[PDB]
Amino acid sequence: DTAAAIRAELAKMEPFFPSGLKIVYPYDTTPFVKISIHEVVKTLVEAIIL
Amino acid sequence: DIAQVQVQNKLQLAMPLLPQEVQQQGVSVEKSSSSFLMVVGVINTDGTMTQEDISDYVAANMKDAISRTSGVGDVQLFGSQYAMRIWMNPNELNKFQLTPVDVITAIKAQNAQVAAGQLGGTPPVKGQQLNASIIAQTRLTSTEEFGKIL
Amino acid sequence: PNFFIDRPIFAWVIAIIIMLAGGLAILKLPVAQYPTIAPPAVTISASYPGADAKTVQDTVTQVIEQNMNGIDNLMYMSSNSDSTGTVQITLTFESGTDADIAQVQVQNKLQLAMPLLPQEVQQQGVSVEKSSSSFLMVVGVINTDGTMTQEDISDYVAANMKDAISRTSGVGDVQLFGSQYAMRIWMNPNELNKFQLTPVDVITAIKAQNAQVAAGQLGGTPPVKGQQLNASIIAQTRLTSTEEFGKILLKVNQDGSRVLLRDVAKIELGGENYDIIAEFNGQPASGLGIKLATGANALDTAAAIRAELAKMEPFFPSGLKIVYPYDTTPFVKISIHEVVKTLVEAIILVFLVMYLFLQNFRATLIPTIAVPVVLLGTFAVLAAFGFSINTLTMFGMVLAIGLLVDDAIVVVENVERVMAEEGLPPKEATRKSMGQIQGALVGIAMVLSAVFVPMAFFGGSTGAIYRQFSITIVSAMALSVLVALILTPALCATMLKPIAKGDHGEGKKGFFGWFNRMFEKSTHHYTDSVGGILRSTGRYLVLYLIIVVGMAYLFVRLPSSFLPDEDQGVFMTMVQLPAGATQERTQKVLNEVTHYYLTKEKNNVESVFAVNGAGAAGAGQNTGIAFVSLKDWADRPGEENKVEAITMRATRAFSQIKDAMVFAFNLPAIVELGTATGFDFELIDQAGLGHEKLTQARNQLLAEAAKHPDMLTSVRPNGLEDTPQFKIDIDQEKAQALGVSINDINTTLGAAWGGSYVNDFIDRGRVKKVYVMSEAKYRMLPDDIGDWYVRAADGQMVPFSAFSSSRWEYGSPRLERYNGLPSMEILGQAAPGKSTGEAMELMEQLASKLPTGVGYDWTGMSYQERLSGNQAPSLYAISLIVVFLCLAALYESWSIPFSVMLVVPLGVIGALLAATFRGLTNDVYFQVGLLTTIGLSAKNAILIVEFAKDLMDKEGKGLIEATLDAVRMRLRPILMTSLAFILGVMPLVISTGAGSGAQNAVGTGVMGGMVTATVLAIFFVPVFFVVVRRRFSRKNEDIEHS
Amino acid sequence: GADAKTVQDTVTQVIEQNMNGIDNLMYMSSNSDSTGTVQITLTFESGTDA
Amino acid sequence: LPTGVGYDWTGMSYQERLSGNQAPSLYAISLIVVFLCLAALYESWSIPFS
Ligand SMILES: CCCCCCCCCCCCO[C@@H]1O[C@H](CO)[C@@H](O[C@H]2O[C@H](CO)[C@@H](O)[C@@H](O)[C@H]2O)[C@H](O)[C@H]1O
């Protein structure tokens, strides 16, 4: 949630950035929690199929 | 929240016993994680700017708002904000028989905001008919005026 | 359930228990006008004496905006930087945040920013406060003999009254309106110059001869052996008289003469600040703003306060009387009076219908006993969930009466019917019938809470308002069904008199009952007709479809509101003069208005409170406000004696026949909220741009919305436009040359024109301030600059005309910020037929038209709502799904739930009809009303279809016959209730006097809905059941006899 | 160094004046010292959140 | 004592003043709780009086 809010703020700042200003994302504990818990959900449903 | 309250309430009792340099450079009390949740990157692709230009765009356009994001404990700057940098020459200073202290005092004097007053100020005189703001000594703005500092 | 029919004492005991806890809750329960509705806001306020807008924006404001981070649950941060030297930072938080925690976090981050502040600001005190704008009452304090000036009075407040009122029980906050006494030293520049002295020396003097000093002690520790005395050293003491301040030395002259302060400057006890000058019916006054304690009872806080003032009455100085310019309390006294009045009347009407319909006295005593119990209990259930007796919760009960009343009636009736039909003894009739309506009763509770709880989960201020009604009503309802299953059956089975089989009393009596045949005949007429319509149904299906499309049309073409505006015994008129105007001019206007209300409204206006210096627009000499109090409502009978009409003739009065802008208006009801069809735009300077560029973008947008009057309407900025300001360019070179310290130039200039808080002194036992400033006559006009001289290094005086060049420029008097950044506020509302949303979309489109570095944003009201409207469809989809699921349980049908759900429009067409022909608007009271109405139609249809199904299944009767019999036996109760309801509500629909806006809002929609819904349902429901029932199954069939 | 009567109507009663609308306050008592310390105790309704 | 000299209890004596002023109320309710209860379990309306 904290992270989703921050992505909202950065997005609200995007159009007023100087010429050439891109944001990069070198490190975030977020994508692992997301894809990991999603694989566990994949598994429950798969398991119901079996 | 409460722990933070009890802690900062002891910190303010310690504050007067602190240095003025320490005091005004700012002390912070935070309920934070010891690990970064995330690291946000800022670059320029078309490389029309050095790291400082960037460091300042970050510190001057983004970092205040990100640290006001609800739920964000600490934000660390990989870089720094812009500052008025006065880099003294020991030789060219000694030549004129002046010391760093005089640089300090000078800047303190020719650069400031000043409580002025008001034309038609309150409490006025009978029938009086003009009210306006006195604009006095204002902070310096550009770099060059720091050269015209006498 | 059946259980109590054989245990009437146990029932009585639970009843008593509910009554006692409820009565206990009634005794120790809070009262307020409204609950907490607005999101939490905490403001940091600070003042920088003499400084200008840009100064306070650039010495404090930005320093604080930068130091306020990592504070929990922040929504938005908005601030004013005033050229009156005050800076205010609003931090508005997410709704439901711990108010107190937020305020604590804000004030501790500020306590960290404090060392980075100016020394003057730091020492004047920065304050952190919670921001409800809702004072319980505003007490005026005056003098009759023109004995004392307003500074005198203000001080009298601060030194004699303010403390005891804050000792009054139930008073959680006392705010002071005015300024305290100060030691005011008004320098004379001429007699200052005569003696070659500058304000600087005045400063240094006053700081020096007036001070407390760390002394010490005789017999101090560790003393010497045998030592014999311990006592206190009393040293240099602060001054006490004004006179002692006259005797302070500024210089010794060579010829032995001394130069005292008394000489260069007039010295007197006078106001800490003179911006705001207040007059009460012309006579001078000061004021006290009392806020209700947290969770406290309003009526007793007010009563206690008036009593406290009376206990102080004989101790007031000559001519000092206390007045009450603003008081929420009688609005609440009278509204409470009206709600209970309605409840008892309603009870009376249910007795009157119950007699003039069942005419058996002990029958009529049953529902009479029922509801009191239920009310009481709901008060306890509410108390348990931490509410108070306030407007919203009470009109929630007023709405609940319908459901309570119906439930009681349903039971008593059905029992009576079972007797007059079958010849059962009272009790056996009771088990037959409780056992007849039971499932319908639990189901109706499930469906009623199924529509009423989803609206509890609305978010934001809108969500709070809904939450009140939702809980009050569901609790009243759930208790009414428990009571309908435990006590009512007990009361039925026990105290009810037995009826002869096939009685109907179809005559027997001469005086009172010549009606029973008339009703009997007609109830058969009715069912005759119903079968008749069940013959050809199609035509009637058409009628329905028509009714619905029409209902939609009525729904769309009806106006949305938030709440009905209320004459509250009080209104106000605001006054705005041309930029840079004078205290004395604004004051002149305000005296004129004051008189207008005291003239052309000799009979309506009780008292007028003119405040010069503080307004709507902001602070400054340039603005005024008028607080206008109105006579008690009994003395204002007519249509012309009401606030709408008054504010009309006053705005009409001060528009055409004035030289400056004067609006007159009435406050909203929940006094901190928004203008239903309006919005609050924030135009934000996003790039490293300029104030000049931002304002130009603002003009640009004002123009582009000027081009769209079919969508947006009267779109306007909410700030102060630029004023001409006086620039003093100091030549650093010349001043350093002629031998003058720039500091001496600055601080003499300051202490001359802006003033300086120097030291503190102790009057009568209370520490106050010491201000040194020019005299009036030497600091008004720009030329006066010349009268002030700066002493040089050597010992010589220097005119400002020697090193200071001067001019005029433009500048801004009010510098606004949004989220740390430079911003500009833009208020507005939508076109007459157009929706606030459309107007907002167009506004985003226009603001998108702006130059680069210009972003846009929403704040306040527009924030809370842009979140909240996303939810009505979702919550109501939840509701349909849940209710259908419930009815799907109750029968054992996935389809029969449609024969009752199909009934919902029947009631709406009455509400929408009734609002439009009455000229009302689609607001809360109307919406809660619509739901309430849906609630009765759903109840009745659920009972009808239950009965129908029951004869079909557990009696093997046919279809058309079964529904026939059904609607037959359940005609009478329907009609009984609806008679009761329409009669109790009717007062709400036809009422003026206090609070009648809300009362009409409830009453109308409801009444219209009741009428069309029952007088439609008795015909449309049977077709619903029948037509639906005929989409199942394989023959099977249509039917009968097994 | 200040005296009792000094610290009491400069510090004690000044601070005692804002102690209204405090939830669950039972009683408030305060001391004023010429040894230089000034102290105000707030005793609260039993079961109040400390 | 002379007019304007009032009196009070605090701390131990306060709390004691409390238990004293609460004893009758306690006996009213607790007696009444039981009357209500026996009238319930024992369907008799009379068993409570005796
Ligand atoms: C609570 C107060 C109620 C106030 C209502 C005021 C009056 C208006 C509503 C009454 C509507 C009923 O009007 C009803 O029409 C149907 C058929 O369409 C009639 O039925 C009649 O026509 C159909 C065919 O055309 C046949 O079945 C025929 O045998 C005959 O009964 C009913 O005999 C009549 O009673």
Numbering used by the authors:
A (entry chain A): 301 to 350
B (entry chain A): 101 to 250
C (entry chain B): 2 to 1043
D (entry chain C): 51 to 100
E (entry chain C): 851 to 900
Kindly provide excerpts from the paper associated with this entry.
AcrAB-TolC is the major multidrug resistance efflux pump in Escherichia coli, where AcrB is the efflux transporter residing in the inner membrane of the bacterium, playing an important role in capturing and expelling a range of structurally diverse substrates. AcrB is homotrimeric with the three monomers suggested to cycle between three conformational states known as loose/access, tight/binding, and open/extrusion during substrate export. Crystallographic studies of AcrB have revealed that large substrates e.g. erythromycin bind the proximal pocket in the access/loose monomer (access binding pocket) while smaller substrates e.g., doxorubicin and minocycline bind the distal pocket in the binding/tight monomer (deep binding pocket).The proximal and distal sites are separated by a short “gate” loop (herein defined to consist of residues 615FGFAGR620) that has been suggested to regulate the progress of substrates through the export pathway. During efflux, large substrates such as erythromycin are proposed to undergo a sequential export process, first binding the proximal pocket, then passing the gate loop to the distal pocket, and subsequently being extruded out of the cell via TolC.
The first, AcrB(AAA), contains three mutations (F615A-F617A-R620A) chosen to remove bulky side chains from the gate loop. The X-ray diffraction data obtained for AcrB crystals in the presence of erythromycin revealed electron density consistent with this antibiotic occupying the proximal pocket. The occupancy of erythromycin was estimated at 0.89 for the wild type structure, and 0.86 and 0.88 for the AcrB(AAA) and AcrB(ΔLoop) variants, respectively. Erythromycin-soaked crystals remain asymmetric, as in the apo-structures, and contain only 1 occupied binding site per trimer. The one major difference between the gate loop variant structures and the wild type is the lack of a contact between erythromycin and the central phenylalanine residue of the gate loop (Phe617). The absence of Phe617 in the gate loop variants does not lead to lower occupancy of erythromycin relative to wild type AcrB. No evidence of erythromycin bound to the distal pocket was seen for the wild type AcrB or either gate loop variant. The results presented here suggest that disruption or even removal of the gate loop is not enough to facilitate occupation of the distal pocket by erythromycin—at least in crystallographic soak experiments involving isolated AcrB. Strains expressing gate loop variants were both found to be highly susceptible to erythromycin, when compared to those expressing the wild type (MICs: wild type AcrB 500μM (or 367 μg/mL), AcrB(AAA) 125μM (92 μg/mL), AcrB(ΔLoop) 62.5μM (46 μg/mL), AcrB-negative control 31.25μM (23 μg/mL)). The work reconfirms the importance of the gate loop in the AcrB erythromycin-export mechanism while establishing that the interaction with the gate loop is not essential for the binding of erythromycin to the proximal binding pocket.
